[PDB]
């Protein structure tokens, strides 16, 4: 896996709280980042995973953690899904559009025969190193709580290196 | 250009009049087909080109012509857009989703740096031969009327070899 | 397609209003251009398409739009065809000869089997970018009227960038 | 990642309750399996993750789930570690030895510059398909209860497809 | 040079006395053929070479020789030229159009710089073998009568195999 | 074979008398060294070869010869093995851990299909040159006295070149 | 064909009226040269072509033209032949020996099958440009007088640049 | 090392008790073999190693062990060294000549810049598998006794596989 | 060198006693052959070497040894040189012409700079194996006497294999 | 053949009149050299070729010619053979050992399947140019007299360019 490797440069358009912005790796430098990948906007499954993360967003920002959800849809589609779904509407973090599939391929998370990203979550530290990876098949939910636990644990480890036992 | 070449095999999902279906080159054999490519669903450009083709869909079905609109979005996104835009709601032809971009690259119509298709239209005869091609930059609309004209002329020619 | 790409350098001989001139990409820089390819001079096909463009040439020149018809025939052949056909004689725009096929191939418009160019039209802006492409099989006609509308729309968006939908 | 791909064939020796057995992919067919990778036996870090999984092994087995812990150490070393650690002693599932690193590389889980496996867990279904993947850096712990939840969800979805919450 | 090699197959359209026809290598088998290449139709240069050949045409046809003029122009353009030029209208032999340049290239006679054939004449016997070659720069003329001499001698040497001194 | 070639650079962890130290080729410069490779710690075969070398370690040290036993196990495992085997307990020289198999491959001594080192001994002189090589299949023992003889011969020849018996 | 290209450099030995000399491309610069290739010395075929050229030699030398006969035989063999054959002894121009086949190959005139040059004549102007080419199969003759015509016209066209019709 | 690999096919001439014979791998099948490599015949160092082996030859034949000494010299040289040196004279085993260096290269025992083999000894079982390897620099003697010990140990192991301890 | 290799197939024209014949490797099979290469006919060098071979030809034929002189000159040139030189006229063996250089290259004996063959002699046995090679720079002469001794020795060992030293 | 080409650089050990020395192409510069290759020392073929060259060594040293015999054996073997064969004992020129075969391959004279050199002699002038080459199969002896003759002629030619 990509565990313990440095993220790659990227440049994508995103939808964030009613506005379109540009996100690059420069924007992640010096902060804790979560790249949350999912297959596609507007499908028939409920966005509970994305919603669960939105429910814990405020707490994640306290920890200084930025969140970026990613799918191969465009940021335009994201804006429309954001105003058509009650759950998605709760999202205040950036929703990156990756139509070229480059961000998704950077994380080796592309299903090439579908052109859609897999259900993968990556935790990245301030130096751009992946400290936690979680991948799941459809129906096996990614728990935002366990995600918070891992991040706190990863932040703890960075402050207290070599934790003897 | 691809003028006068045979279209390639393809298998994509699509939204058509409320239902999701599969489309392949096999569904085009024996028919006149129009492949209408555009950049993306839900942007801020007026969907007049798509709606205009819809206004003429009635007439095209009479000439035995099928219409397939194509973008790199999913069929799911087409369904959503079809319920959001009054102009898109008029569409009764198949809206093909090409998330992998394979259908788009078949017609050598991909902007690789954007992951979206260029505004291209192709007219294909019953034998899979591209008989007319039209491509324009954004802001320069495609006229549905001119399309119908080209299609009738294309049909004449096939039944009245060289005059 | 070649949509949104810059035209490539070229150098050909042409017939324009009784004389032989040389055209290069230099002449198109800073101007709007229409490259109108066709298969061949002196064929039994009605020159209706070329004359049709001639009919709109005055308005095109008024709009800063140059026109260049192109075929793999020589510029010598164009002179003859021009003083031979009532329709072709109406043409005041340059008639480029492309016997090496280079100009035609720059636009990826060659029917390699016949050594003749396909029936394609290209609209190029002052910076050399292709903004509109049209290609048709023999017998399917190009409407000069449609070309005019497109050219105007092209000029419009160059002047009014990112005009969102009202 | 390896999500949704089929596990590759393998043949390793392991230590299972005072015994040395062989384990191959055939042993996993028609069963639910958890492949638990860790870097090394006998190190200073508390074998917390290994023990937590040991505690929930009763439950896992009730669910028809087999567990295999894996490291590049040999089975001989696992047997020794199992005799000296109170925590490791409570392990009743198979402890696979992967000295050639073939098993580890099959799951693309090798830290090449160390010759040790990364902290990664893989849930594999009866047809050998990887349904869940978890990888963490040293210090970040893997929660066995979170694993149990995922396993039950994977079984539920296998048994009842499409019963996924409908949108609006 | 191509001297003493067999001509390559070809298929071209041509103009021959009011009508359009198709010439192919098969139309040369068992016959003496002369391929006369020239740069271009409707030029400002005197059509002398082609005309001086039309004159000796009855004679040539008698010796069992066929004449094929070749240019990279189309056959449509040939018809037109054999109607606006007095000298050209005297041509009873086939005027081949070679817009793809294949026939010219078969004879290695293309001026790649211009997409026009060079001033070259070839003599091909019934077996498809080139027995005489003549290439001239624009300006020097190709003597029609001398061509006839070559054909006579070529025709003799063919009848009375290498006659020692 | 690697006879008469210079040893390659290396950096490994080892267990030396209750401690964990690092060992690199720099540690061997200006010294005589014996690199003793074996397949695995904690296995069933009697650690005879390892102990025999342990017994003669006093003598070896009197001669200015350092000993390094090597296996693809980790140093952590060597420390554990050193605490449970009476024979291994008498080892006072460094026990190098080579989990990435880099040291082992430097001496071209890896059984690739097992990820374990072959039974091979290498005598390296002060300038890092390999002067003697010995490799045996499992079951065929390496004699520490035969090793001592070779080492003394290697030192004698280094000190007195050409003093080799004259022919007739 | 090589029509209208610049001759390539070369260095060869040759026989010219009782003595041996060295001809090189430099000896052609600023001069009109005729390269006359023939298969082989001491053959059983009439040396007519070479002899018919010797006759017009005074004339040619007057028009500022140099003549070089070329064969893959050595120059030693040329001296010998210009002593046992009456026709050959009339030659005042340089007889070049081309045993390596380089000169023949420069002019793409080698019959690789036999290691002998084909019957070809080339006209090169002072700038080293080939203006006329003639290749003939063994048997057909190369008209010496016609060669002269070509030279005259070639020489004219060079003086009075392309004179339109 | 080559430990535990199968020897490669070979075919060399050898000198054995006054006679020249041919040795191939077929000759080793079903028996225990010792390939004793050394740099060169007639040097100034004493052949004690080869002599020590000769002293233990009889005992090695009892164990069913064949011995083949090898150097890149020819078998002719071997015959002469055998009758010039008292020590070599004691040798009753085969002395293989390997002038092409193939046997030596088969065992990866060549010093390429010298064209001489290294001081390497290989013990090969009846199935052609190398069970013991010993390599030594000049002056560090190979002890025939330790060699006998290893062979007996290897023969024991083959009769009593998996010797528990 | 080519020592102990089999000659390669070949096909050339030669002049032999007033006529033109064709020689191939077929003619050498079953016989002993001497291929005597030299640089050129009609040169100012004394033909002493070729005539020297002529002088021993009768004894060579008596021994079953054919001889072939070879140069890149044509067989036509050989005829002339033969009826022109008192020395060359003594030759009754075939004089091969190798203008393509193929025969000469088969024996790796070409001076690529001059297009002429080097002064080399090759002795070929009935099975096509080269048993003796001799090459010299211009001016260093080949002794026909030495060639004869070698040929005899060659024939001797073919008849008496592995003759150890007395 | 290698006729008229320049010899290549080489460094070999040799036995010469009781002593071991090193020989390189540098030792040949400015002198006439004879490289005499043969298969192997100690075989059963009469060493007449080598002894014959020895008989003429005296005379060759006068013409300023060095002689180097070469085989793929070591210099050690040459020393031994020089003490065993009465014919070889007459040799006062350098006997080069070419165990790696590099000197032999330089003169493209190796029988690769045997690891021995073919019976070849090469005459090299002061500038390293091979002026005469002679190769024969076993049983067909090389005549030392003919060699001397070739060498004198070679020397004449170098001082009397083309005659």
Coordinates of C-alpha atoms in Angstrom, one line a residue, chain J residues 46-99:
Chain J
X46 CA 57.8 -32.8 -33.4
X47 CA 58.8 -29.2 -32.3
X48 CA 60.7 -28.7 -35.6
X49 CA 59.0 -25.5 -36.4
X50 CA 60.0 -23.8 -33.2
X51 CA 63.6 -25.2 -33.3
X52 CA 63.9 -24.2 -36.9
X53 CA 63.1 -20.6 -36.0
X54 CA 65.7 -20.9 -33.2
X55 CA 68.4 -22.0 -35.7
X56 CA 67.7 -18.8 -37.6
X57 CA 67.4 -16.6 -34.5
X58 CA 71.0 -15.6 -34.7
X59 CA 70.4 -14.2 -38.2
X60 CA 67.1 -12.5 -37.3
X61 CA 68.7 -10.5 -34.4
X62 CA 71.1 -9.2 -37.0
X63 CA 68.2 -7.9 -39.2
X64 CA 66.8 -6.3 -36.0
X65 CA 64.0 -8.8 -35.7
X66 CA 62.5 -10.0 -32.5
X67 CA 60.8 -13.3 -32.2
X68 CA 57.8 -14.1 -29.9
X69 CA 56.4 -17.6 -29.8
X70 CA 52.9 -17.8 -28.4
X71 CA 50.6 -20.5 -27.0
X72 CA 47.7 -20.5 -24.5
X73 CA 49.9 -22.2 -21.9
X74 CA 51.4 -20.3 -19.0
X75 CA 55.0 -18.9 -19.0
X76 CA 55.5 -21.6 -16.3
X77 CA 54.7 -24.3 -18.7
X78 CA 57.1 -22.8 -21.2
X79 CA 59.9 -22.9 -18.7
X80 CA 59.3 -26.5 -17.9
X81 CA 59.1 -27.5 -21.6
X82 CA 62.3 -25.5 -22.3
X83 CA 64.1 -27.8 -19.8
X84 CA 62.5 -31.0 -21.1
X85 CA 62.8 -30.8 -24.8
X86 CA 66.3 -30.6 -26.4
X87 CA 64.7 -28.9 -29.4
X88 CA 63.0 -26.3 -27.2
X89 CA 66.1 -25.7 -25.2
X90 CA 67.7 -24.0 -28.3
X91 CA 65.1 -21.2 -28.0
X92 CA 66.6 -17.8 -26.9
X93 CA 63.6 -15.7 -28.0
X94 CA 60.6 -14.9 -25.7
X95 CA 58.1 -17.7 -25.2
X96 CA 54.9 -15.9 -24.4
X97 CA 52.2 -17.4 -22.2
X98 CA 48.6 -16.4 -23.2
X99 CA 46.4 -18.2 -20.7

